[PDB]
A paper describes a structure:
Central to the replication cycle of influenza viruses is the viral RNA-dependent RNA polymerase which transcribes and replicates the viral RNA genome. The influenza virus RNA-dependent RNA polymerase is a heterotrimeric multifunctional machine composed of polymerase basic 1 ([name]), polymerase basic 2 ([name]) and polymerase acidic (PA) subunits, that catalyzes both primer-independent replication (vRNA to complementary RNA (cRNA) and cRNA to vRNA synthesis) and primer-dependent transcription (vRNA to mRNA synthesis) in the nucleus of infected cells. [name] houses the polymerase active site, whereas [name] and PA contain, respectively, cap-binding and endonuclease domains required for transcription initiation by cap-snatching. High-resolution structures of the complete viral polymerase from a number of human, avian and bat [name] viruses, as well as influenza B, C, and D viruses have been determined. These structures have revealed that the polymerase is a highly flexible macromolecule that can assume a variety of distinct conformations, enabling the polymerase to perform both transcription and replication that require different initiation and termination mechanisms.
Using cryo-EM we determined the structure of 17 polymerase-nanobody complexes at resolutions between 4.5 and 6.7 Å; this is sufficient resolution to accurately position each nanobody bound to the polymerase heterotrimer. Three nanobodies (Nb8189, [name], Nb8201) bind at an interface formed by PA residues 615–630 and [name] residues 10–15 (site 4b). Interestingly, we observe different potencies for nanobodies that bind at similar locations, for example Nb8189 and [name] which bind the same site on the C-terminal domain of PA; this is likely due to differences in the affinities of each nanobody for a given site. In addition to the core of the polymerase which was resolved in all structures, the PA endonuclease was resolved in the majority of structures (excluding Nb8189, [name], Nb8192, Nb8196, Nb8202), while the C-terminal domains of [name] remained unresolved in all structures. [name], Nb8191, Nb8192, and Nb8207 caused a significant reduction in viral titre at most time points tested. [name], Nb8191, Nb8192 and Nb8207 were shown to significantly inhibit viral mRNA synthesis. The site bound by [name] corresponds to a site against which the 627 domain of [name] is packed in the transcriptase conformation, potentially preventing the polymerase from assuming the transcriptase conformation. Accordingly, [name] inhibited transcription although it had no effect on the binding of the polymerase to Pol II CTD.
Author numbering:
A (entry chain F): 1 to 25, 32 to 51, 58 to 100, 111 to 122
B (entry chain A): 200 to 716
C (entry chain C): 1 to 249
D (entry chain B): 1 to 185, 207 to 756
RNA sequence: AGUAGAAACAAGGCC
RNA sequence: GGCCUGCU
């Protein structure tokens, strides 16, 4: 029932900024997967993992039906596919973020 | 055959004629009217005729509606505990005896002989309302009689002290007015009722906040030695035992547990002495036995309690005692917290520190306090604070584990990934692991048991009401109120002078400020 | 012999004679409950306060002729001062423990036969077999269930006549039990407890508990059987279920 | 960082952690002195909520009474006791229409019970105000004293052994010119008609202690013995009625209350479609008892008992007739202190009528000035309303009538409401197509409540969307949530005896695990703490320790004497084998197979001088007054051991002029023991009949000697000795 | 003095 | 000074 589409990824400069957005068909989470690993917690809505706290902000518009991840001061270690997720189970396909 | 006859007659009939609506003359007529009565839309007529100002209009409850609770203003709040909590000092022996095992007086004397540096006591901070020289003389008397016990053959299990004028004043002896008859005392102008008015108003101080802060901190000892249980046979029993072991590891090294043991022991000894030695003043050393990290058992002597005459008939009758406790905290920095204490200088202590060695002063907090049978009984059941707290934590764990079909205790206690808001720092709200929540709830329960009062009950009820309303607001349930000002006035009348309830009100105001966003 | 003798001794003194003469049988209960002792409002507080006294409990006068007034070191075990409104004497709790180490001994083989319910519970649990604990949300729904697992399909009054005829065969009065189930129960519990000397009142109380059906409303999830409800605290929880099979099955 | 537990509610919902908001780990508030001030305040408050009524003076008691019924309709939201007779009669009529046959049936069972009830049923009650001594005494003692006085005055119909006959005698006493009472200081005093009327219509006022949840203390009342039979019958009728009403929750327990609340919320919300909005009001009624006029209860019962035998109507109507003229004793009195002369004094409340007002403060001075006009013979007339929930069930009936009056058949509008009422508390689920509809529905419900003398506390009430509410400390949030803080005070030693305390503690742990969702590890911790406190309270330590106590020597020798020490009870200094699986087993039976036969026999010996059993009712029933609730009784499983002793009694009667009561107690107990030895079934089934003691005892001596010879120990010598001794006691009773 | 908080304790009564 | 009571 809940489909999810991520937007706002791409190639960015180190120290740059990026606004991810996840449109949907509930609490939301943002998770990431680097090419050599499984899922890493980024944010949920608020709470932020240690590797991303203070740099990144999660927000949502319940009238647009969208969750946002505002990423700032990006590091090469943030390079991952960023997946949006919905819970009462529902996972997006993920948007590629590449920081260099 | 027989017919039962229950006839109203005589005086009882006339009473029946005077217990009717205003426009009825006899019970016969009223019963006839009732039997002949049938509904013909009479509620509607009076509802239409009734004034429209009689309404229950719903006032919407929004984020901007609730205002912070006002706290009373006045002289700072004082200390009410029956013993020192944050400023206690421990003299130890490192003996292998268990909590109840041993004899009190010998242990106290042995612990006190472990300290060297005694000085002739002198006044540092006076009581400001009593006779401090009496406290000084009482301390020296206690020392002298302790030596007197040390000399003789076998340390008595319980000692009685002499009834000198010093402790006669300190314990309030022969001060109750003599009971007489009204017919003999009517012309005395000063004769009036007992003073019955609202307690004095006092504003909150910052010392209770720090005391609670350090009441939730870990320690270098285990202050709970639990009893035995039947060997676990069911897997659920194994899960319960593992959970219980985790919580015991978390809470045993906590100042709240030390306060629990202190209060339980002190109140038990005081009640037993009052029930046994009703007439004669009795000496009781404050003893608490812990276990070090190395595993060696240890005893600790905070001070002494002198119990006075305790002919307690009613549950509210008061037994007065005088408490003496060693400490290192100078009372010249927060004098308003020690309004009812007399503090002397009794020695100097040397604790190993990298700054040469401190050679700190070592003071004696001496005060006259009192309790009652109900207070003693309830203070000797302080161990149920452990229950309250850990039941709350286990309810949290079970509720979260009902989501993920698996027991979630081990990762909660080891990974420490999840955290709950358990305090606010100037930077913002601070979250701590589940163990810190355990300790915080345990400290809250302990302080509830220590600073219990009617103010606490009233504020708790009338603030739980507002907390439920605020929770409904935060849940998007369109909460409404009929008279919110009345509820606010009901809450604000419970805050008078108790430090604990005022701190709870300040916490509630902070929670409202952080909530409603 | 004795009974009528203290009867005559009572009637010898004028006050007790008047009490015996003017008081009718129906008022028996009233005067038996006639007491100045108020029912305690806070039992825990006073139990914690009385036990710190010497001689805090009460015992029949006969204790003065079975237990010595003092033990080896001289700690007093009983006092000769009677209670407030009774002929019983106040005694120390040691007189209890003393009775358990040097007091008279008897044959307690028949207590298992009397306290049938509790021993049946013990036997059922001893042979029980536990299982894995499954963690999942339990939908506890509130239902009316029978707690007593040995009820013989009798009500309170229905089994009260059976109990009297089993214990007090002469005070039955008009009633002669018709149902044959009651006949067999009377026969069994008569031949089983023929010489048991615990007390008529306790025997009657435990027979009432065992035979009379009792029901209470409880939050249950599954189970619903009488044997599965006594262990409802151990098998069902907020987020965990513990499979259990009592020894009976 | 500053620690703040309240901030925990920012992540955990309020109801999921509501236990933290219950400070039930400290001493509850207690009253210290007289309750006279509270009694006077309550009387004045009850009289001024009905000030606009009409005043009269009773021709029998001569006391001023205020009748507000059918008075002017309220024009403000303040509490008002101006109930309208026609409105309440119509409400009862609609209640009957929605539940046909309710009143007739309930009256039938009540008639059965009243005509088969016995006098002894009045002994099964707590403290009651004995007028023979003007003080509170146990129900049995007061009943016995009143029966003795009646028999001395010539009212001996109660000898029939029927409660209805006792009430007949009580009413006949009202028409006597001069009764006689006994006082010890024995003196025979004569009471005229009016004095006895006031003594029979009066109530005794005390202060309620151990009341958690409010800053101020309250006053409660206890009635006499003349009026308790009528109250019993009226409450029997009301209970039979409420048992047929699903909207009532007073005659049920807690779990039934929760089940009914869940059912009603599901019914109201589920039936509501998407267009209808639903709102729950968590309502409390301010001054519930002070605004309920006994005359209105009289009206309700006379409507209920229509088309019934006139004697039934009269006997059920006597009670509200007496409540409408009820008087209240002011209380213990007032204590004064003089610091200049350093003395104290205690003036009884009866002097408040004449004592000067120089000794009283402004508040008490004004209270006395306002209540003096109502003072008659040291007691104040309290006609306008009930004092303390004596008619709980009738009040619940009225509230249920109000609740049912909005079944959408009487509302005649889109909005409608339902809910659950338990006296002084209610939950009201109101549905309506729009917020305006909800507002109109709640407004009309409030208005109708004000027409029945019932007021809604706006300060302690709030309305939200359905799904979250409260009811009698039960917090519903999409399903009831356990609290466990209400039962915390019951986790200690009860205070009955050793075996009883052990069984009660383990059973309480078990029950709170079943009902209040107590966790396994928490239950184990509770067991450990309870065992520790139990050992420290009864001076029964493990025995292998060196904790010197007054009982540590005998325990240690018993320990060293026993071979299988695992079978020793915790009361005798043995190990604790209890666990989550063993919480439903008595200690004796759990350790039965481990005990040594010598210790087992010594422990469970019938000849022990400690065990004492009085009646079937008091075998294994313990009265534990629960926190935040009325006194309750619990069945606890225990084996009669030497540890089942009963504790010492007060013993302070010896210093009072009422010292002869102890001699009467001893003589009555001796006679009762003799009768029980003569009639073994005396305890289990209370004997009935109209003969006297000695007749039954002597005749049974005859017969038992006979038959026990026809087979048994007796011999001709002894049988004839008994026969002629029976003749001797016969001729002694002759003279 | 102290406990405590809308009234009390800080022993009572009897010789 | 001697003795009594500790929910009456």
């Amino acid at each position: 029932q809940v489909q999810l589409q991520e937007s706002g990824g791409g190639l960015v400069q180190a120290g740059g900024s990026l606004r991810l957005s996840c449109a949907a068909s509930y609490t939301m989470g943002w998770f990431r997967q680097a090419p050599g690993k499984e899922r890493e917690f980024v944010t949920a809505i608020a709470n932020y993992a240690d590797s991303v706290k203070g740099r990144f902000t999660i927000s949502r518009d319940n009238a647009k039906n969208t969750a946002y991840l505002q990423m700032n001061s990006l590091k090469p270690e943030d390079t991952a596919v960023y997946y949006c997720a919905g819970k009462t189970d529902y996972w997006g396909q993920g948007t590629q973020v590449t920081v260099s | 055959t027989i017919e039962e006859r229950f006839e109203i007659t005589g005086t009882m009939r006339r009473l029946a004629d005077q217990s009717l609506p205003p426009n009825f003359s006899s019970l016969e007529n009223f019963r006839a009217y009732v039997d002949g009565f049938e509904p013909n839309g009479y509620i509607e007529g009076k509802l239409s005729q009734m004034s429209k100002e009689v309404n229950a209009r719903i006032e919407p409850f929004l984020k901007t509606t609730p205002r912070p609770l006002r706290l009373p203003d006045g002289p700072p709040c004082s200390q009410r505990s029956k013993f020192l909590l944050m400023d206690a000092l421990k003299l130890s022996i490192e003996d292998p005896s268990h909590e109840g095992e041993g004899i009190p007086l010998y242990d106290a004397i042995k612990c006190m002989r472990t300290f060297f540096g005694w000085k002739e006591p002198n006044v540092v901070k006076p009581h400001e309302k009593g006779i401090n020289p009496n406290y000084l003389l009482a301390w020296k008397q206690v020392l002298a009689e302790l030596q007197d016990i040390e000399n003789e053959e076998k340390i008595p299990k319980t000692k009685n002290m002499k009834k000198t004028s010093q402790l006669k004043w300190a314990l309030g002896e022969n001060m109750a007015p003599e009971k007489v008859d009204f017919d003999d005392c009517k012309d005395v102008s000063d004769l009036k009722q007992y003073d019955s008015d609202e307690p004095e108003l006092r504003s909150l101080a910052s010392w209770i906040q720090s005391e609670f802060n350090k009441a939730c901190e870990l320690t270098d000892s285990s202050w709970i030695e639990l009893d035995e249980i039947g060997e676990d046979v069911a897997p659920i029993e194994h899960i319960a035992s593992m959970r219980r072991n985790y919580f015991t590891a978390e809470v045993s090294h906590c100042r709240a547990t030390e306060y629990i043991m202190k209060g339980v022991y002190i109140n038990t000894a005081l009640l037993n002495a009052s029930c046994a030695a009703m007439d004669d003043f009795q000496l009781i050393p404050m003893i608490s036995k812990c276990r070090t990290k190395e595993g060696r058992r240890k005893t600790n002597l905070y001070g002494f309690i002198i119990k006075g005459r305790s002919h307690l008939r009613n549950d509210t009758d008061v037994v007065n005692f005088v408490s003496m406790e060693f400490s290192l905290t100078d009372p010249r920095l927060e004098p308003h917290k020690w309004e009812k204490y007399c503090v002397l200088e009794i020695g100097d202590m040397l604790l190993r520190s990298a700054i040469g060695q401190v050679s700190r002063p070592m003071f004696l907090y001496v005060r006259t306090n009192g309790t009652s049978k109900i207070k003693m009984k309830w203070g000797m059941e302080m161990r149920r604070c452990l229950l309250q707290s850990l039941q709350q934590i286990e309810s949290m764990i079970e509720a979260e584990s009902s989501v993920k079909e698996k027991d979630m205790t081990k990762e909660f206690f080891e990974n420490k990934s999840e955290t709950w808001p358990i305090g606010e720092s100037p930077k913002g709200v601070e979250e701590g692991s589940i163990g810190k929540v355990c300790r915080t709830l345990l400290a809250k329960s302990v302080f509830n048991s220590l600073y219990a009062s009617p103010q606490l009950e009233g504020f708790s009820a009338e603030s739980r009401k507002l907390l439920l309303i605020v929770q409904a607001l935060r849940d998007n349930l369109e909460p409404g109120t009929f008279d919110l000002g009345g509820l606010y006035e009901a809450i604000e009348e419970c805050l008078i002078n108790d430090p604990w309830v005022l701190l709870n009100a300040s916490w509630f105001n902070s929670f409202l400020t952080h909530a409603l966003r | 012999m004795e009974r009528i003798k203290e009867l005559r001794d009572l009637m010898s003194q004028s006050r007790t004679r008047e009490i015996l003469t003017k008081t009718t049988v129906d008022h028996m209960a009233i005067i038996k409950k006639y007491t100045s002792g108020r029912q305690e409002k806070n039992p825990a507080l006073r139990m914690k306060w009385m036990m710190a006294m010497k001689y805090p409990i009460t015992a029949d006068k006969r204790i003065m002729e079975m237990i010595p007034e003092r033990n080896e070191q001289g700690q007093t075990l009983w006092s000769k001062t009677n209670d407030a409104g009774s002929d019983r004497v106040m005694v120390s709790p040691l007189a209890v423990t003393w009775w358990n180490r040097n007091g008279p001994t008897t044959s307690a083989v028949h207590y298992p036969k009397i306290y049938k319910t509790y021993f049946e519970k013990v036997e059922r649990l001893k042979h029980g077999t536990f299982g894995p604990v499954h963690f999942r949300n339990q939908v506890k729904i509130r239902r009316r269930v029978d707690i007593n697992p040995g009820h013989a399909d009798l009500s309170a009054k229905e089994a009260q006549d059976v109990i009297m005829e089993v214990v007090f065969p002469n005070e039955v009065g008009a009633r002669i039990l018709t149902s044959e189930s009651q006949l067999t129960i009377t026969k069994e519990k008569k031949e089983e407890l023929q010489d048991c000397k615990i007390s008529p009142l306790m025997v009657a109380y435990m027979l009432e508990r065992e035979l009379v059906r009792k029901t209470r409303f409880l939050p249950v999830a599954g189970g619903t059987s009488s044997v599965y409800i006594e262990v409802l605290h151990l098998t069902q929880g907020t987020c965990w279920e513990q499979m259990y099979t009592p020894g009976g099955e | 960082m500053d620690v703040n537990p309240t901030l925990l509610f920012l992540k955990v919902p309020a109801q999921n952690a509501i236990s933290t908001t219950f400070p039930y780990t400290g001493d509850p508030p207690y009253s210290h002195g007289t309750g006279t001030g509270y009694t006077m305040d309550t009387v004045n408050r009850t009289h001024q909520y009905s000030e606009k009524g009409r005043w009269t003076t009773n021709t029998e008691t001569g006391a001023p009474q205020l009748n507000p019924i059918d008075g002017p309709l309220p024009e403000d939201n303040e509490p008002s006791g101006y109930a309208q007779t026609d409105c309440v009669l119509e409400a009862m009529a609609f209640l009957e229409e929605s539940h046909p046959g309710i009143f007739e049936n309930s009256c039938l069972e009540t008639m059965e019970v009243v005509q088969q009830t016995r006098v002894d049923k009045l002994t099964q009650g707590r403290q009651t105000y004995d007028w023979t001594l003007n003080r509170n005494q146990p129900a049995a003692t007061a009943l016995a004293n009143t029966i003795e006085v009646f028999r001395s005055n010539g009212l001996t119909a109660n000898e029939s052994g029927r409660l209805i006959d006792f009430l007949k005698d009580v009413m006949e006493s009202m028409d006597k010119e001069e009764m006689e009472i006994t006082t010890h200081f024995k003196k025979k005093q004569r009471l005229n008609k009016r004095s006895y009327l006031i003594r029979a219509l009066t109530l005794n006022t005390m202060t309620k202690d151990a009341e958690r949840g409010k800053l101020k203390r309250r006053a409660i009342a206890t009635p006499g013995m003349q009026i308790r039979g009528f109250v019993y019958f009226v409450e029997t009728l009301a209970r039979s009625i409420c048992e047929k009403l699903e909207q009532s929750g007073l005659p049920v327990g807690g779990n039934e209350k929760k089940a009914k609340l869940a059912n009603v919320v599901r019914k109201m919300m589920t039936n509501s479609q998407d267009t209808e909005l639903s709102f729950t009001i968590t309502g409390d009624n301010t001054k519930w008892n002070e605004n309920q006029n006994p005359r209105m209860f009289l009206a309700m019962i006379t409507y209920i008992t229509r088309n019934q035998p006139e004697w039934f109507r009269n006997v059920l109507s006597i009670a509200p007739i007496m409540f409408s003229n009820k008087m209240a004793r002011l209380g213990k009195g007032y204590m004064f202190e003089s610091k200049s002369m350093k003395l104290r004094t205690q003036i009884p409340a009866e002097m408040l009528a004449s004592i000067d007002l120089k000794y009283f403060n402004d508040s008490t001075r004004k209270k006395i000035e306002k209540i003096r006009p109502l003072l008659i013979d040291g007691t104040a007339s309290l006609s306008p309303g009930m004092m303390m929930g004596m008619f709980n069930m009738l009040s619940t009936v009225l509230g249920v009538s109000i609740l049912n009056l909005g079944q959408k058949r009487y509302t005649k509008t889109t909005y409608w409401w339902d809910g659950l009422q338990s006296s002084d508390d209610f939950a009201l689920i109101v549905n309506a197509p729009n917020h305006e509809g909800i507002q109109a529905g709640v407004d009309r419900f409030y208005r109708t409540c004000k027409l029945l003398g019932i007021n809604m506390s706006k300060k302690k009430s709030y309305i939200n969307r359905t799904g979250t509410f409260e009811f009698t400390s039960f917090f519903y949030r999409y399903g009831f949530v356990a609290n466990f803080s209400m039962e915390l005070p019951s986790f200690g030693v009860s205070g009955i005896n050793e075996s009883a305390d052990m069984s009660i503690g383990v059973t309480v742990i078990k029950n709170n695990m079943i009902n209040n969702d107590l966790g396994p590890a928490t239950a184990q911790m509770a067991l450990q703490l309870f065992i520790k406190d139990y050992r420290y309270t009864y001076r029964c330590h493990r025995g292998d320790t060196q904790i010197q106590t007054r009982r540590s020597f005998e325990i240690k020798k018993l320990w060293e004497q026993t071979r299988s020490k695992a079978g020793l009870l915790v009361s005798d200094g043995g190990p604790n084998l209890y666990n989550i699986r063993n919480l439903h087993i008595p200690e004796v039976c759990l350790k039965w197979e481990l005990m040594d036969e010598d210790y087992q026999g010594r422990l469970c010996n019938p000849l022990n001088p400690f065990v004492s059993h009085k009646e079937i009712e008091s075998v294994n029933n313990a009265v534990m007054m629960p926190a935040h609730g009325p006194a309750k009784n619990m069945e606890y499983d225990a084996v009669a051991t030497t540890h089942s002793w009963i504790p010492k009694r007060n013993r302070s009667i010896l210093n009072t002029s009422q010292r002869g009561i102890l001699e009467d107690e001893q003589m009555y107990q001796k006679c009762c023991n003799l009768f029980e030895k003569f009639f073994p079934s005396s305890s289990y089934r209370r004997p009935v009949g109209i003969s006297s003691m000695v007749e039954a005892m002597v005749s049974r001596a005859r017969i038992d000697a006979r038959i026990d010879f026809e087979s048994g120990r007796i011999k001709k010598e002894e049988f004839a000795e008994i026969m002629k001794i029976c003749s001797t006691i016969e001729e002694l009773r002759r003279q």
